[PDB]
Design brief:
- Chain B: Belongs to the proteasome subunit p55 family.
- Chain B: One of its GO terms (biological process) is protein deneddylation.
- Chain B: Residues 84-258 form the PCI domain.
- Chain B: Acts as a regulatory subunit of the 26S proteasome which is involved in the ATP-dependent degradation of ubiquitinated proteins.
- The structure is cut from a larger assembly and holds chains A, B and C.
- By secondary structure, chain A is mostly helical.
- Chain A has helices at residues 3-13, 27-30, 37-53, 61-71.
- Chain A has 4 helices and no strands.
- Chain A is globular, with a radius of gyration of 15 Å.
- Chain B folds into 2 domains: 1-207, no CATH class; 208-256, no CATH class.
- In chain B, 60% of the residues lie in helices and 2% in strands.
- Chain C is mostly helical.
- Chain C starts with a helix and ends with a helix.
- Classes of the chains: A mainly alpha, B mainly alpha, C mainly alpha.
- Chains in contact: A-B, B-C.
- Chain B binds chain C through residues 231-232, 235-236, 241-248, 254, and chain C through 23, 26-28, 30-32, 35.
Protein backbone atom coordinates (compact mmCIF):
# COMPACT_ATOMS: atom_id res chain seq x y z
CA UNK A 1 0.00 0.00 0.00
CA UNK A 2 0.91 3.68 -0.28
CA UNK A 3 -0.05 6.80 1.65
CA UNK A 4 -2.19 8.11 -1.22
CA UNK A 5 -3.36 4.67 -2.38
CA UNK A 6 -4.88 4.09 1.06
CA UNK A 7 -6.22 7.66 1.18
CA UNK A 8 -8.26 6.94 -1.96
CA UNK A 9 -10.39 4.62 0.19
CA UNK A 10 -10.75 7.11 3.06
CA UNK A 11 -11.87 9.98 0.83
CA UNK A 12 -14.39 7.68 -0.89
CA UNK A 13 -16.06 5.46 1.73
CA UNK A 14 -16.23 8.28 4.28
CA UNK A 15 -17.73 10.62 1.66
CA UNK A 16 -20.97 8.60 1.79
CA UNK A 17 -21.07 8.64 5.62
CA UNK A 18 -21.78 11.47 8.04
CA UNK A 19 -18.67 12.69 9.88
CA UNK A 20 -17.52 15.65 11.96
CA UNK A 21 -14.89 18.31 11.14
CA UNK A 22 -13.01 17.43 14.34
CA UNK A 23 -12.24 13.93 13.02
CA UNK A 24 -9.03 13.75 10.99
CA UNK A 25 -8.44 11.09 8.34
CA UNK A 26 -4.68 11.74 8.10
CA UNK A 27 -4.02 9.96 11.41
CA UNK A 28 -5.57 6.76 10.03
CA UNK A 29 -3.29 6.70 6.96
CA UNK A 30 0.35 6.98 8.05
CA UNK A 31 -0.21 4.94 11.21
CA UNK A 32 -1.81 2.11 9.21
CA UNK A 33 0.42 -0.12 7.09
CA UNK A 34 -0.41 -2.99 4.70
CA UNK A 35 -4.20 -3.17 4.90
CA UNK A 36 -6.65 -4.53 2.34
CA UNK A 37 -9.68 -2.72 0.93
CA UNK A 38 -12.25 -4.15 3.34
CA UNK A 39 -10.08 -3.63 6.44
CA UNK A 40 -9.82 0.11 5.75
CA UNK A 41 -13.51 0.18 4.78
CA UNK A 42 -14.31 -1.55 8.08
CA UNK A 43 -12.67 1.35 9.95
CA UNK A 44 -15.29 3.77 8.64
CA UNK A 45 -17.95 1.09 9.20
CA UNK A 46 -16.92 0.31 12.79
CA UNK A 47 -16.66 4.03 13.56
CA UNK A 48 -20.32 4.37 12.63
CA UNK A 49 -21.24 1.34 14.72
CA UNK A 50 -19.47 2.71 17.81
CA UNK A 51 -21.20 6.06 17.24
CA UNK A 52 -24.59 4.32 17.45
CA UNK A 53 -23.38 2.59 20.62
CA UNK A 54 -23.02 6.11 22.05
CA UNK A 55 -26.08 7.23 20.01
CA UNK A 56 -24.28 9.54 17.60
CA UNK A 57 -25.19 10.28 13.98
CA UNK A 58 -21.72 11.61 13.09
CA UNK A 59 -18.12 10.35 13.34
CA UNK A 60 -15.95 12.06 15.95
CA UNK A 61 -12.21 11.80 16.58
CA UNK A 62 -12.62 9.64 19.71
CA UNK A 63 -14.69 7.07 17.80
CA UNK A 64 -11.87 6.65 15.27
CA UNK A 65 -9.27 5.77 17.91
CA UNK A 66 -11.62 3.26 19.55
CA UNK A 67 -12.18 1.52 16.21
CA UNK A 68 -8.49 1.85 15.29
CA UNK A 69 -7.12 -0.53 17.94
CA UNK A 70 -9.27 -3.40 16.61
CA UNK A 71 -8.09 -3.40 12.97
CA UNK A 72 -4.54 -2.14 13.54
CA UNK A 73 -3.00 -5.49 14.55
CA UNK A 74 -3.90 -8.52 12.42
CA UNK A 75 -0.90 -10.57 13.64
CA UNK A 76 -1.17 -12.30 17.02
CA UNK A 77 1.63 -14.76 16.19
CA UNK A 78 5.09 -14.68 17.77
CA UNK A 79 8.56 -15.84 16.66
CA UNK A 80 8.55 -13.46 13.68
CA UNK A 81 11.24 -11.14 12.29
CA UNK A 82 13.73 -14.00 12.70
CA UNK A 83 16.83 -13.75 10.51
CA UNK A 84 18.75 -16.03 12.91
CA UNK A 85 18.79 -19.59 14.31
CA UNK B 1 -22.46 33.89 41.79
CA UNK B 2 -23.43 34.43 38.14
CA UNK B 3 -20.86 32.12 36.50
CA UNK B 4 -22.15 29.80 33.77
CA UNK B 5 -19.46 28.71 31.31
CA UNK B 6 -17.03 27.87 34.12
CA UNK B 7 -19.44 25.45 35.82
CA UNK B 8 -20.47 23.99 32.45
CA UNK B 9 -16.94 23.24 31.23
CA UNK B 10 -15.95 21.58 34.52
CA UNK B 11 -19.04 19.36 34.65
CA UNK B 12 -18.63 18.45 30.97
CA UNK B 13 -15.06 17.21 31.55
CA UNK B 14 -16.11 15.07 34.55
CA UNK B 15 -19.58 13.48 34.36
CA UNK B 16 -18.88 12.18 30.84
CA UNK B 17 -16.00 10.03 32.14
CA UNK B 18 -17.75 9.47 35.50
CA UNK B 19 -20.64 7.06 34.98
CA UNK B 20 -20.08 3.74 33.22
CA UNK B 21 -23.85 3.25 32.86
CA UNK B 22 -24.08 1.22 36.06
CA UNK B 23 -26.68 3.03 38.18
CA UNK B 24 -29.23 4.98 36.13
CA UNK B 25 -31.05 6.51 39.11
CA UNK B 26 -28.53 9.28 39.84
CA UNK B 27 -27.17 9.38 36.28
CA UNK B 28 -30.40 10.51 34.60
CA UNK B 29 -31.12 13.18 37.22
CA UNK B 30 -27.68 14.80 37.04
CA UNK B 31 -27.58 14.99 33.23
CA UNK B 32 -30.76 17.10 33.35
CA UNK B 33 -28.73 19.80 35.12
CA UNK B 34 -25.81 19.41 32.71
CA UNK B 35 -28.07 19.99 29.69
CA UNK B 36 -29.47 23.19 31.23
CA UNK B 37 -25.98 24.68 31.60
CA UNK B 38 -25.52 24.49 27.82
CA UNK B 39 -28.92 26.14 27.28
CA UNK B 40 -28.11 29.14 29.48
CA UNK B 41 -24.70 29.37 27.80
CA UNK B 42 -26.40 29.43 24.39
CA UNK B 43 -24.70 26.37 22.88
CA UNK B 44 -27.11 24.37 20.72
CA UNK B 45 -24.51 21.78 19.67
CA UNK B 46 -23.70 20.57 23.19
CA UNK B 47 -27.37 20.53 24.22
CA UNK B 48 -28.21 18.26 21.28
CA UNK B 49 -25.42 15.82 22.16
CA UNK B 50 -26.53 15.62 25.80
CA UNK B 51 -30.14 15.01 24.70
CA UNK B 52 -29.17 11.78 22.89
CA UNK B 53 -28.33 9.85 26.08
CA UNK B 54 -31.15 9.63 28.63
CA UNK B 55 -34.05 10.57 26.33
CA UNK B 56 -34.09 7.21 24.54
CA UNK B 57 -33.20 5.21 27.67
CA UNK B 58 -36.16 6.68 29.59
CA UNK B 59 -38.66 5.11 27.17
CA UNK B 60 -37.52 1.63 28.21
CA UNK B 61 -37.37 2.71 31.86
CA UNK B 62 -40.64 2.84 33.83
CA UNK B 63 -42.59 6.06 33.48
CA UNK B 64 -41.79 8.67 36.14
CA UNK B 65 -43.41 12.05 36.67
CA UNK B 66 -40.65 14.65 36.97
CA UNK B 67 -38.26 12.92 34.54
CA UNK B 68 -40.77 13.03 31.69
CA UNK B 69 -41.71 16.63 32.55
CA UNK B 70 -38.07 17.74 32.33
CA UNK B 71 -37.77 16.35 28.80
CA UNK B 72 -40.75 18.46 27.70
CA UNK B 73 -39.12 21.66 28.97
CA UNK B 74 -35.57 20.97 27.75
CA UNK B 75 -36.69 20.24 24.19
CA UNK B 76 -38.46 23.62 24.12
CA UNK B 77 -35.48 25.50 25.58
CA UNK B 78 -33.17 24.13 22.87
CA UNK B 79 -35.57 25.45 20.20
CA UNK B 80 -34.45 29.05 20.84
CA UNK B 81 -31.64 28.76 18.30
CA UNK B 82 -33.36 26.20 16.06
CA UNK B 83 -36.84 27.80 15.96
CA UNK B 84 -38.40 24.81 14.18
CA UNK B 85 -42.11 24.45 14.93
CA UNK B 86 -42.38 21.11 13.10
CA UNK B 87 -39.78 19.27 15.20
CA UNK B 88 -41.04 20.60 18.54
CA UNK B 89 -44.61 19.61 17.64
CA UNK B 90 -43.52 15.97 17.44
CA UNK B 91 -41.99 16.22 20.92
CA UNK B 92 -45.31 17.45 22.35
CA UNK B 93 -47.19 14.36 21.15
CA UNK B 94 -46.19 12.57 24.38
CA UNK B 95 -47.29 15.33 26.77
CA UNK B 96 -50.67 15.48 24.99
CA UNK B 97 -51.40 11.97 26.29
CA UNK B 98 -49.57 12.60 29.58
CA UNK B 99 -51.85 15.37 30.85
CA UNK B 100 -54.93 13.53 29.55
CA UNK B 101 -54.11 10.34 31.50
CA UNK B 102 -51.65 10.98 34.34
CA UNK B 103 -52.63 14.60 34.98
CA UNK B 104 -56.01 16.37 34.78
CA UNK B 105 -57.55 19.09 32.62
CA UNK B 106 -55.86 21.74 34.79
CA UNK B 107 -52.50 21.38 33.02
CA UNK B 108 -54.03 19.85 29.87
CA UNK B 109 -55.69 23.09 28.75
CA UNK B 110 -52.51 25.22 28.39
CA UNK B 111 -50.63 22.36 26.70
CA UNK B 112 -53.49 21.97 24.22
CA UNK B 113 -53.13 25.56 23.01
CA UNK B 114 -49.33 25.23 22.84
CA UNK B 115 -49.14 22.04 20.76
CA UNK B 116 -51.53 23.52 18.19
CA UNK B 117 -49.38 26.66 17.87
CA UNK B 118 -46.50 24.49 16.66
CA UNK B 119 -48.83 22.69 14.23
CA UNK B 120 -50.29 25.94 12.86
CA UNK B 121 -46.76 27.24 12.21
CA UNK B 122 -45.53 23.89 10.88
CA UNK B 123 -44.40 24.22 7.23
CA UNK B 124 -46.07 21.01 5.96
CA UNK B 125 -46.38 17.29 6.56
CA UNK B 126 -48.27 14.08 5.80
CA UNK B 127 -49.59 13.73 9.37
CA UNK B 128 -51.13 17.21 9.56
CA UNK B 129 -54.43 15.84 8.23
CA UNK B 130 -54.61 13.19 10.96
CA UNK B 131 -53.73 15.79 13.63
CA UNK B 132 -56.87 17.81 12.87
CA UNK B 133 -59.28 15.37 14.53
CA UNK B 134 -56.88 14.04 17.22
CA UNK B 135 -58.73 12.31 20.11
CA UNK B 136 -60.01 14.78 22.72
CA UNK B 137 -61.37 17.24 20.13
CA UNK B 138 -64.78 18.69 21.01
CA UNK B 139 -64.06 19.03 24.72
CA UNK B 140 -66.21 22.20 24.94
CA UNK B 141 -63.28 24.49 25.72
CA UNK B 142 -62.85 28.19 25.00
CA UNK B 143 -59.24 27.77 23.86
CA UNK B 144 -60.06 24.68 21.79
CA UNK B 145 -62.73 26.41 19.70
CA UNK B 146 -60.33 29.24 18.83
CA UNK B 147 -57.60 26.88 17.60
CA UNK B 148 -60.05 24.51 15.88
CA UNK B 149 -61.41 27.31 13.69
CA UNK B 150 -57.83 28.42 12.95
CA UNK B 151 -56.95 25.05 11.40
CA UNK B 152 -59.94 25.16 9.04
CA UNK B 153 -59.31 28.88 8.44
CA UNK B 154 -56.42 28.32 6.01
CA UNK B 155 -58.80 26.83 3.43
CA UNK B 156 -61.17 29.82 3.36
CA UNK B 157 -58.63 32.41 4.54
CA UNK B 158 -58.84 35.66 2.56
CA UNK B 159 -56.56 37.50 5.04
CA UNK B 160 -59.36 40.05 5.47
CA UNK B 161 -60.11 39.17 9.11
CA UNK B 162 -56.52 38.15 9.95
CA UNK B 163 -55.67 41.36 11.89
CA UNK B 164 -59.07 41.29 13.62
CA UNK B 165 -58.88 37.74 15.00
CA UNK B 166 -55.37 38.15 16.42
CA UNK B 167 -56.40 41.21 18.46
CA UNK B 168 -59.46 39.76 20.21
CA UNK B 169 -58.06 36.28 21.00
CA UNK B 170 -54.25 36.00 21.21
CA UNK B 171 -53.54 33.16 23.67
CA UNK B 172 -50.67 31.63 21.67
CA UNK B 173 -50.94 33.95 18.67
CA UNK B 174 -49.50 37.46 19.07
CA UNK B 175 -48.36 37.86 22.69
CA UNK B 176 -47.00 34.58 24.07
CA UNK B 177 -44.77 34.58 27.15
CA UNK B 178 -44.91 30.78 27.63
CA UNK B 179 -42.35 28.42 26.08
CA UNK B 180 -41.16 31.09 23.62
CA UNK B 181 -38.04 33.21 23.96
CA UNK B 182 -37.69 36.62 22.38
CA UNK B 183 -37.23 40.36 22.84
CA UNK B 184 -40.68 41.27 21.44
CA UNK B 185 -43.75 39.88 19.68
CA UNK B 186 -42.39 40.65 16.19
CA UNK B 187 -41.39 37.00 15.78
CA UNK B 188 -45.01 35.91 16.20
CA UNK B 189 -46.11 38.37 13.50
CA UNK B 190 -43.50 37.32 10.94
CA UNK B 191 -43.66 33.55 11.51
CA UNK B 192 -47.46 33.38 11.44
CA UNK B 193 -47.66 35.50 8.28
CA UNK B 194 -45.37 33.12 6.38
CA UNK B 195 -47.71 30.17 6.97
CA UNK B 196 -50.99 31.93 6.14
CA UNK B 197 -49.62 33.13 2.79
CA UNK B 198 -48.40 29.68 1.72
CA UNK B 199 -51.78 28.17 2.59
CA UNK B 200 -53.52 31.07 0.83
CA UNK B 201 -51.88 30.36 -2.53
CA UNK B 202 -52.38 26.61 -2.01
CA UNK B 203 -56.18 26.83 -1.91
CA UNK B 204 -56.34 29.36 -4.77
CA UNK B 205 -54.90 26.69 -7.08
CA UNK B 206 -57.83 24.44 -6.10
CA UNK B 207 -60.42 27.23 -6.48
CA UNK B 208 -59.34 30.09 -8.78
CA UNK B 209 -57.94 28.77 -12.05
CA UNK B 210 -57.11 32.26 -13.38
CA UNK B 211 -56.74 35.40 -11.27
CA UNK B 212 -55.35 38.89 -11.82
CA UNK B 213 -52.00 39.58 -10.16
CA UNK B 214 -53.26 42.98 -9.00
CA UNK B 215 -56.03 41.26 -7.04
CA UNK B 216 -53.65 38.56 -5.78
CA UNK B 217 -51.44 41.12 -4.01
CA UNK B 218 -54.41 42.43 -2.01
CA UNK B 219 -55.43 38.90 -0.99
CA UNK B 220 -51.92 37.95 0.18
CA UNK B 221 -51.33 41.18 2.16
CA UNK B 222 -48.10 41.76 0.23
CA UNK B 223 -46.63 44.01 -2.47
CA UNK B 224 -45.16 43.49 -5.93
CA UNK B 225 -41.74 42.62 -4.50
CA UNK B 226 -43.04 40.71 -1.46
CA UNK B 227 -45.35 38.49 -3.53
CA UNK B 228 -42.54 36.96 -5.61
CA UNK B 229 -40.56 36.12 -2.45
CA UNK B 230 -42.96 33.59 -0.92
CA UNK B 231 -44.09 31.95 -4.17
CA UNK B 232 -40.47 31.37 -5.21
CA UNK B 233 -39.85 29.12 -2.20
CA UNK B 234 -42.98 27.02 -2.79
CA UNK B 235 -42.03 26.11 -6.37
CA UNK B 236 -38.30 25.62 -5.71
CA UNK B 237 -38.96 23.21 -2.82
CA UNK B 238 -41.38 21.14 -4.91
CA UNK B 239 -44.58 21.95 -3.00
CA UNK B 240 -46.95 23.58 -5.50
CA UNK B 241 -46.78 25.40 -8.83
CA UNK B 242 -48.44 28.47 -10.30
CA UNK B 243 -48.24 31.00 -13.13
CA UNK B 244 -46.58 34.41 -12.68
CA UNK B 245 -46.62 36.94 -15.53
CA UNK B 246 -44.76 40.12 -14.64
CA UNK B 247 -45.63 42.24 -17.72
CA UNK B 248 -49.13 40.78 -18.13
CA UNK B 249 -50.05 40.71 -14.40
CA UNK B 250 -51.72 37.32 -14.90
CA UNK B 251 -51.67 34.49 -12.35
CA UNK B 252 -53.10 31.15 -13.48
CA UNK B 253 -53.11 27.51 -12.36
CA UNK B 254 -51.06 26.26 -15.35
CA UNK B 255 -53.01 23.05 -15.87
CA UNK B 256 -50.59 20.32 -17.07
CA UNK B 257 -51.32 18.88 -20.51
CA UNK B 258 -48.97 15.91 -19.97
CA UNK B 259 -52.00 13.64 -19.43
CA UNK B 260 -52.44 13.32 -23.23
CA UNK B 261 -56.10 14.43 -23.01
CA UNK B 262 -58.43 11.81 -24.49
CA UNK B 263 -55.83 9.06 -23.97
CA UNK B 264 -56.28 9.38 -20.19
CA UNK B 265 -58.82 11.97 -19.01
CA UNK B 266 -61.62 10.19 -20.91
CA UNK B 267 -61.98 7.90 -17.87
CA UNK B 268 -64.38 10.48 -16.41
CA UNK B 269 -66.88 10.00 -19.26
CA UNK B 270 -67.16 6.20 -18.99
CA UNK B 271 -68.97 6.42 -15.63
CA UNK B 272 -71.59 8.77 -17.09
CA UNK B 273 -73.44 6.13 -19.12
CA UNK B 274 -72.25 3.19 -17.00
CA UNK B 275 -75.26 3.82 -14.73
CA UNK B 276 -77.52 4.59 -17.72
CA UNK B 277 -78.71 1.15 -18.82
CA UNK B 278 -78.34 -0.16 -15.25
CA UNK B 279 -80.64 2.36 -13.54
CA UNK B 280 -83.26 2.36 -16.31
CA UNK B 281 -83.39 -1.44 -16.47
CA UNK B 282 -84.06 -1.59 -12.73
CA UNK B 283 -86.81 1.05 -12.82
CA UNK B 284 -88.76 -0.61 -15.66
CA UNK B 285 -89.86 -3.43 -13.35
CA UNK B 286 -90.11 -1.21 -10.26
CA UNK B 287 -92.53 1.25 -11.88
CA UNK B 288 -94.79 -1.56 -13.12
CA UNK B 289 -95.16 -2.89 -9.56
CA UNK B 290 -96.72 0.32 -8.23
CA UNK B 291 -98.84 0.69 -11.37
CA UNK B 292 -100.23 -2.85 -11.17
CA UNK B 293 -100.80 -2.85 -7.41
CA UNK C 1 -2.01 34.44 -14.01
CA UNK C 2 -2.36 30.66 -13.99
CA UNK C 3 -3.66 29.04 -17.16
CA UNK C 4 -5.26 26.11 -15.33
CA UNK C 5 -6.97 28.41 -12.83
CA UNK C 6 -8.40 30.50 -15.68
CA UNK C 7 -9.67 27.32 -17.35
CA UNK C 8 -11.66 26.42 -14.22
CA UNK C 9 -12.85 30.03 -13.86
CA UNK C 10 -15.36 29.60 -16.68
CA UNK C 11 -16.38 26.26 -15.15
CA UNK C 12 -17.15 27.97 -11.84
CA UNK C 13 -18.77 30.82 -13.77
CA UNK C 14 -21.30 28.44 -15.36
CA UNK C 15 -21.64 26.39 -12.16
CA UNK C 16 -22.89 29.27 -10.02
CA UNK C 17 -24.88 30.58 -13.00
CA UNK C 18 -26.68 27.27 -13.57
CA UNK C 19 -27.66 27.23 -9.89
CA UNK C 20 -28.95 30.81 -10.19
CA UNK C 21 -30.77 30.18 -13.47
CA UNK C 22 -32.38 27.04 -12.04
CA UNK C 23 -33.95 29.26 -9.38
CA UNK C 24 -35.36 31.50 -12.12
CA UNK C 25 -36.50 28.76 -14.51
CA UNK C 26 -38.19 26.63 -11.82
CA UNK C 27 -41.15 29.03 -11.33
CA UNK C 28 -43.27 30.20 -14.26
CA UNK C 29 -41.44 31.89 -17.15
CA UNK C 30 -42.32 35.04 -19.14
CA UNK C 31 -40.64 37.47 -16.74
CA UNK C 32 -38.83 40.63 -17.81
CA UNK C 33 -35.20 40.19 -18.82
CA UNK C 34 -34.29 43.41 -16.97
CA UNK C 35 -35.60 41.87 -13.74
CA UNK C 36 -33.46 38.79 -14.42
CA UNK C 37 -30.31 40.89 -14.80
CA UNK C 38 -31.04 42.66 -11.50
CA UNK C 39 -31.04 39.32 -9.65
CA UNK C 40 -27.88 38.08 -11.36
CA UNK C 41 -26.16 41.47 -11.29
CA UNK C 42 -24.49 41.36 -14.72
CA UNK C 43 -25.00 43.08 -18.07
CA UNK C 44 -28.18 42.36 -20.02
CA UNK C 45 -26.15 41.28 -23.05
CA UNK C 46 -24.04 38.99 -20.84
CA UNK C 47 -27.11 37.37 -19.26
CA UNK C 48 -28.76 36.86 -22.65
CA UNK C 49 -25.53 35.54 -24.15
CA UNK C 50 -24.71 32.94 -21.50
CA UNK C 51 -28.32 31.79 -21.12
CA UNK C 52 -28.94 31.34 -24.86
CA UNK C 53 -25.74 29.30 -25.18
CA UNK C 54 -27.01 26.85 -22.55
Amino acid sequence: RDRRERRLIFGTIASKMSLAPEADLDSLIIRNDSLSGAVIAAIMQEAGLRAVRKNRYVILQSDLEEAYATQVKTDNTVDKFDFYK
Amino acid sequence: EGKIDEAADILCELQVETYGSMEMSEKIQFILEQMELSILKGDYSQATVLSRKILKKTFKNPKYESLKLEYYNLLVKISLHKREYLEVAQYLQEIYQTDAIKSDEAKWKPVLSHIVYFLVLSPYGNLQNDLIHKIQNDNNLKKLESQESLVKLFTTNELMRWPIVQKTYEPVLNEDDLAFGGEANKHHWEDLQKRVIEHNLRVISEYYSRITLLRLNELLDLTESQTETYISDLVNQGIIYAKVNRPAKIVNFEKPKNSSQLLNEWSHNVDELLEHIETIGHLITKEEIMHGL
Amino acid sequence: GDELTRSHFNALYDTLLESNLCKIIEPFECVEISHISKIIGLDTQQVEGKLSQM
